[PDB]
């Protein structure tokens, strides 16, 4: 299948991403606490529901939450300021909280049922969000021997997600909080996000030599994000 | 998973 592209709301970021975040791919955004990772997730959960000529995929959303940071009223606000019905947009987001990393892994399996269910409706699932991808794994797998073990569990989790993305033509979007490195990653595309002067947000592609050089810059607004 |  041809890949689809979901607009972020930012023309700058869209150009950096070559039109938007891709289906049949896992896109990881990573950065420090407060850089706007969860805002980008909220914005995409609306943008994907737009028709294709407005940058969306007429799609449904599934959302796995590990830090209780999902905000339905924020979805409503973004939808409202982009011309969409707030409650209809919320209704097309299926939401689960992952209790721990093991539950998080099972939920990917659980998600496939709804993905199958909607596949030939007018609004198939087109976006699967995992926020945070790594927080449970960080907290549970720690100390001597944990590096190998945690990386193995995470790779397995990511493989499950890659399968859904490829099998059902879905964009997977995941967040990862970073502080201080050198660890392997298996996301299709990695985007480094940081908060800059005057509240602007700046995004850069990491280890993507064949993709645009440069940084995109946007603001967090009532429309989600915009240039 | 739950709606909304």
UniProtKB/Swiss-Prot annotation, chain A:
Positions of ATP binding: 31-38
The keyword Nucleotide-binding appears for this protein: yes
Protein's UniProt keywords contain Cell inner membrane: no
Coiled-coil segments on the chain, per record: none
Keywords: ATP-binding, DNA damage, DNA recombination, DNA-binding, Nucleotide-binding
GO biological process: DNA recombination; DNA repair
Domain of life: Archaea
Gene Ontology molecular function: ATP binding; ATP hydrolysis activity; ATP-dependent DNA damage sensor activity; damaged DNA binding
Role: Involved in DNA repair and in homologous recombination. Binds and assemble on single-stranded DNA to form a nucleoprotein filament. Hydrolyzes ATP in a ssDNA-dependent manner and promotes DNA strand exchange between homologous DNA molecules.
Annotated family: Belongs to the eukaryotic RecA-like protein family.
Protein name: DNA repair and recombination protein RadA
Organism of this sequence: Pyrococcus furiosus (strain ATCC 43587 / DSM 3638 / JCM 8422 / Vc1)
């Amino acid at each position: 299948a041809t890949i689809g592209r979901i607009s972020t709301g930012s023309k700058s970021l869209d150009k950096l991403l070559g039109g938007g975040i891709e289906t049949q791919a896992i896109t990881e955004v990573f950065g420090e606490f407060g850089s706007g990772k969860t805002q980008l997730a909220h914005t995409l959960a609306v943008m994907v529901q737009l028709p294709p000529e407005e940058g969306g995929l007429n799609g449904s959303v599934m959302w796995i939450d590990t830090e209780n940071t999902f905000r339905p009223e924020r979805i409503r606000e973004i939808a409202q300021n982009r011309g969409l019905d707030p409650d209809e947009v919320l209704k097309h987001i299926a939401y689960a909280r992952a209790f721990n990393s093991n539950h998080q892994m099972l939920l990917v399996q659980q998600a496939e049922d709804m993905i199958k269910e909607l596949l030939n409706t007018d609004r198939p699932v087109k976006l699967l969000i995992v926020d945070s991808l790594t927080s449970h794994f960080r907290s549970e797998y720690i100390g001597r021997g944990a590096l190998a073990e945690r990386q193995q569990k995470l790779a397995k989790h990511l493989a499950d997600l890659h399968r859904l993305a490829n099998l059902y033509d879905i964009a997977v979007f995941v967040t990862n909080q970073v502080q201080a490195h050198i660890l392997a990653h298996s996301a299709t595309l990695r985007v480094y996000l940081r908060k800059g002067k005057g509240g602007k947000r700046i995004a850069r592609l990491i280890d993507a030599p064949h993709l645009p050089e440069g940084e995109a810059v946007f603001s967090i607004t009532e429309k989600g994000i915009e240039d | 998973f739950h709606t909304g």
